Ligand binder design. Structure first.
Ligand SMILES: *[C@@H]1O[C@H](CO)[C@@H](O)[C@H](O)[C@H]1NC(C)=O
Ligand SMILES: OC[C@@H]1[C@@H](O)[C@H](O)[C@H](O)c2nccn21
Ligand SMILES: [Zn+2]
Length: 1016
């Protein structure tokens, strides 16, 4: 049983945090290898009995959207590459080619007639065309949530298994801008044996190369045993293009990119063109090329050398296939027949390279170092750190996380039944999974694509959201209607989703108001869904046409509720203030919903002509100089006014929060007797450099530390209710809201950077926590890694991805900020946290995009802020590279990422309505999640199969006694189980047939997958 992930510091050869603390970072001219040194080799190292085995691996990097849309690239480029690949590989048996992006391959394959399909299958079966990774895309590693990394891998690999009968075990990640250990975590659990990465900091490449530590067994930071390890190969040079893959001198290597001789437009920037290989020059050319290979081979431990051969959208023209193939074949024939070289070179695939390396390891020829850590933040040269894309296009970053939840919910809700083909459930789920998967591309969620490409991704994600809504609402109808009364029309809307936080108040008026009245419809059913495997209570809110509404459950038990006005903010260009207006026609009703594990609960809203017994009304206070009245229609309590002043609020037994006269948090007091702890929000802006390198979509190159946003005298709105209170303030570019429901506050920022060109807006938290230079940021929502601010690095290098959370702590106190969207952030001084909200850049940053970022739109960012006493917690030691959340902070993260879903019944009467679904579902331990529940079979299959992915996090022990909980056995969630198997995380390979058809729960920090089979 389980590894302790807290108290044992793993012993690794390279631990990236420790290596950063020691490493120099000096940007020194290394010669032809600009960022390295002049490599020397011993010519007698290789001989008749010990030859350098060189695998030249043709490839073509195909971005599913970047400068053109996916479909534009497919029509203009990729359909040709793949057509020509099919023809040339089929005609040339020794030619090889690897392919990464299954989205394009599936797009292609489904346009192929049978003859070509058969031909394609044959070049895959004979090993000439090899799929690497096999994901739908090559995902970003900074902003992506691990659940979506696994989704897009499963989408591509399930397609490959079904249509090509192959499952890749080698991964190829040549382009994401920095690399995360979440990848080997997911890959290793999905049957992978090896992986290749490229974009790591040039200083790290030089450091590892010096020690021949470019190939290593990459384990997770908390892994003491090393069972998570995956063999990784890091490429050594500046790019994956031909000039940077043959050896250390690009002026030489460029001469062996035969597409650069003129007729393809392309040329060599180092001024020496390739020349066709002939008998008159083959010897000289071979000398040149082998010398480059033998230099590159010096950086590695075995006698097996990987030479990628490709670049972006290569192998497009038939003439290009011929010019590369024929010229390399001429080199290989000469080189391999010249004993004096002691080289055997051939086209290969990636798996061939790794198979050969491991054969060399097994022969005792090499031992490999172990490594843990991550590879952020990347810089490709000088002080050009790629921390800009941790925030770029934040509207779509947030939309990613919204779609993530709705895909999970729709797959889970619809999994409980088998559906007739006419329902189109599988079709809709496939479309949603594929649009979300596509967006995980390293120019998708990263916000590094052209404006019109961003719009395409946005439209596709909008379609996905609608598809999820359709599936979820049909599922709810079926799950909550008496079976003998259930009468579906599969094109009808029984329920509409109500989402309070997307697109968000002030972003879009998309919420429907429930219209009730004594003379018309008196009442309305609403339904909440809880995707998490434990009972959950959460305040939910609805818009209603009257303030006089009562809430009941479906046993007619009253439910305590609170009504508040609907407040919207407007840039009142008449008075030149950002101020709130109250609705006179609709109101917000809020109540606590309690919902079963992975289940549903129905409530009823009912109108009355006066105040209901169990409904209370918020008070409202507008703090501003020179106030004017704010009428609220029928709302029964008048708004109060006041001059700006410090205020204090407390909901329930929860913390007391104090606010500045500018409506920004100043302090938090946890309990009535405890101290008021300074926690101050502030908004600042970064600018761009006037001379030298410009920030763009990719790069963050600030012109110095951020300067405070001048606030003036902003308007502050205070709402005080029994269930929920809030302070909102209209600041320049940001409506900032602090919401209190009785535990950790929620923060919402409506961010509209307007036409503030060349500006980045940051939210900072200033505390007196003595964190020093240490802080913690998450990786892909999966784990928290210790960061150390280094003064030897510039500010932008100390920015990291914040895909779900960050924290600082000292011996007694921790401040944790959870996010509902991936953004960039740091701790730039002891006691501070900061997180970038948006950025508007009018300049290109010279990484191939050819535009700045000037397509900003209002976005509602959501957060939770958790202040905790941690002197009693059992924490890792100072040398441990991980941190872990407390239970409160983990639940707060879950509240942002997987909130209850809300449905409003769309017609007047719901005949056969039921009160609950899932009351008998086990309520699992709080650290356990069912990350995926997906039915894997269509309704015609005699044996139905459902897949589950279980993930258990690790939470800090802080002395709260553990409650009794029920064991979750996913294999018994559906009736008539006939088998339970443990599988790889993609569901594609059976790993263990389970005794008694019981799926065991998993250890802390482990993730497992199970498939239950059912007789149907
Ligand atoms: C799929 O690949 C396997 C190798 O695991 C092979 O034995 C089998 O013949 C292939 N199945 C089909 C249907 O082609
Ligand atoms: O500079 C990074 C960009 C990537 O964003 C993109 O995905 C693409 O593959 C590419 N080719 C050349 C440059 N780039
Ligand atoms: Zn790319």
């Amino acid at each position: 049983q389980c590894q302790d992930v807290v108290q044992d510091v793993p012993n690794v050869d390279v631990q990236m945090l420790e290596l950063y603390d020691r490493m120099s970072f000096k940007d020194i001219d290394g010669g032809v290898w600009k960022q390295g040194w002049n490599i020397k080799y011993d010519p007698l190292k290789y001989n008749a009995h010990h030859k350098l085995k060189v695998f030249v691996v043709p490839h073509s990097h195909n971005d599913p959207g970047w400068i053109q849309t996916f479909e534009e690239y497919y029509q203009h480029d990729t359909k040709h590459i793949l057509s020509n690949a099919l023809r040339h590989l089929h005609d040339n048996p020794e030619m090889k080619f690897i392919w990464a992006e299954i989205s394009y391959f599936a797009r292609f394959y489904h346009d192929l007639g049978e003859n070509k399909k058969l031909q394609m299958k044959s070049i895959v079966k004979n090993g000439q065309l090899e799929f690497v990774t096999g994901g739908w895309v090559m995902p970003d590693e900074a902003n992506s949530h691990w659940r979506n990394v696994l989704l897009q891998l499963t989408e591509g690999q399930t397609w490959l298994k079904q249509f090509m009968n192959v499952t890749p075990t080698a991964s190829w990640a040549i382009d994401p801008f920095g690399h995360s250990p979440t990848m080997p975590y997911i890959l290793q659990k999905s049957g992978f044996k090896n992986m290749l990465i490229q974009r790591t900091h040039y200083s790290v490449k030089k450091e590892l190369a010096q020690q021949r530590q470019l190939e290593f067994l990459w384990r997770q930071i908390w892994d003491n045993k090393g069972d998570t390890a995956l063999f990784t190969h890091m490429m050594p040079f500046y790019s994956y293009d031909i000039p940077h893959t043959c050896g250390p001198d690009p002026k030489v290597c460029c001469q062996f990119d035969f597409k650069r001789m003129g007729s393809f437009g392309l040329s060599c920037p180092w001024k020496v063109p390739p020349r066709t290989i002939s008998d008159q020059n083959v010897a000289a050319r071979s000398d040149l090329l082998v010398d480059q290979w033998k230099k590159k081979a010096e950086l590695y431990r075995t006698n097996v050398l990987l030479i990628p051969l490709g670049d972006d959208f290569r192998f497009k023209q038939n003439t290009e296939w011929d010019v590369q193939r024929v010229n390399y074949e001429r080199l290989f024939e000469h080189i391999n027949s010249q004993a004096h070289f002691n080289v055997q070179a051939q086209f290969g695939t990636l798996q061939e390279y790794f198979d050969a390396v491991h054969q060399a390891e097994r022969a005792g020829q090499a031992e490999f170092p172990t490594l843990s850590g991550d590879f952020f933040t990347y810089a490709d040269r000088s002080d050009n750190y790629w921390s800009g894309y941790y925030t770029s296009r934040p509207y779509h970053k947030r939309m990613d996380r919204v779609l993530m939840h709705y895909v999970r919910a729709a797959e889970m809700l619809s999994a409980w039944h088998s559906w007739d083909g006419m329902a189109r459930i599988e079709e809709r789920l496939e479309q949603a999974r594929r649009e979300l998967s596509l967006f995980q591309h390293h120019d998708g969620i990263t916000g590094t694509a052209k404006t019109h490409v961003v719009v395409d991704y946005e439209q596709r994600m909008q379609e996905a959201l609608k598809a999820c809504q359709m599936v979820m609402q049909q599922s709810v109808y079926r799950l909550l209607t008496k079976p003998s009364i259930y009468s579906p029309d599969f094109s009808f809307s029984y329920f509409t989703l109500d989402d309070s936080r997307w697109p968000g108040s002030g972003v879009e008026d998309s919420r429907t108001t429930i219209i009730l009245g004594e003379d018309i419809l008196p009442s309305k059913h609403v339904v909440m869904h809880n995707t998490l495997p434990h009972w959950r209570e959460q305040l939910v809110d609805f818009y209603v046409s009257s303030p006089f509404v009562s809430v009941t459950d479906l046993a007619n038990n009253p439910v305590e509720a609170q009504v508040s006005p609907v407040w919207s903010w407007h840039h009142d260009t008449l008075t030149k203030t950002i101020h709130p207006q109250g609705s006179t026609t609709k109101y917000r009703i809020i109540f606590k919903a309690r919902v079963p594990p992975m289940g549903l609960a129905t409530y009823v809203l009912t109108i009355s002509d006066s105040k209901p017994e169990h409904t209370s009304y918020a008070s409202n206070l507008l703090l501003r100089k020179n106030p004017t009245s704010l009428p609220l229609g029928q709302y029964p309590e008048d708004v109060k006014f006041g001059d700006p002043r410090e205020i204090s609020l407390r909901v329930g037994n929860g913390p007391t929060l104090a606010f500045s006269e500018q409506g920004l948090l100043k302090s938090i007091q946890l309990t009535q007797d405890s101290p008021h702890v300074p926690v101050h929000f502030k908004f600042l802006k970064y600018g761009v450099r006037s001379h030298g390198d410009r920030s763009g979509a990719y790069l963050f190159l600030p012109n110095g530390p951020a300067s405070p946003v001048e606030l003036g005298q902003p308007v502050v709105l205070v709402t005080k209710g029994k269930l929920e209170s809030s302070v909102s303030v209209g600041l320049p570019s940001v409506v900032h809201q602090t919401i209190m429901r009785g535990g950790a506050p929620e923060i919402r920022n409506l961010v509209d950077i307007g036409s503030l060109d060349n500006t980045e807006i940051v939210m900072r938290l200033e505390t007196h926590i003595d964190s020093g230079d240490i802080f913690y940021t998450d990786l892909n929502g999966l784990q928290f890694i210790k960061r150390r601010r280094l003064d030897k690095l510039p500010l932008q290098a100390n920015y990291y991805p914040i895909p779900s959370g960050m924290f600082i702590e000292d011996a007694n106190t921790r401040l944790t900020l959870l996010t509902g969207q991936p953004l960039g952030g740091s701790s730039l001084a002891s006691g501070e946290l900061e997180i970038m909200q948006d950025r508007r850049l009018a300049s290109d940053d010279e990484r191939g995009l050819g535009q700045g970022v000037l397509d900003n739109k209002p976005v509602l960012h959501i957060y939770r802020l958790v202040l905790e006493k941690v002197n009693n917690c059992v924490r890792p030691s100072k040398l441990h590279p991980a941190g872990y959340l407390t239970s409160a902070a983990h639940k707060a993260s879950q509240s942002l990422l997987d909130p209850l879903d809300k449905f409003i019944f769309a017609e007047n009467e719901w005949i056969g309505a039921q009160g609950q679904f899932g009351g008998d579902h086990p309520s699992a331990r709080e650290d356990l999640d069912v990350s995926v529940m997906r039915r894997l079979t269509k309704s015609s299959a005699k044996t139905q199969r459902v897949g589950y992915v279980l993930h258990r996090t690790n939470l800090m022990q802080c002395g709260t006694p553990e409650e009794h909980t029920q064991k979750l056995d996913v294999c018994h969630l559906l009736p008539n189980v006939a088998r339970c198997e443990r599988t790889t995380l993609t569901f594609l390979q059976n790993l263990e047939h389970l005794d008694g058809m019981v799926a065991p729960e998993v250890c802390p920090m482990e993730t497992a997958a199970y498939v239950s089979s059912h007789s149907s």
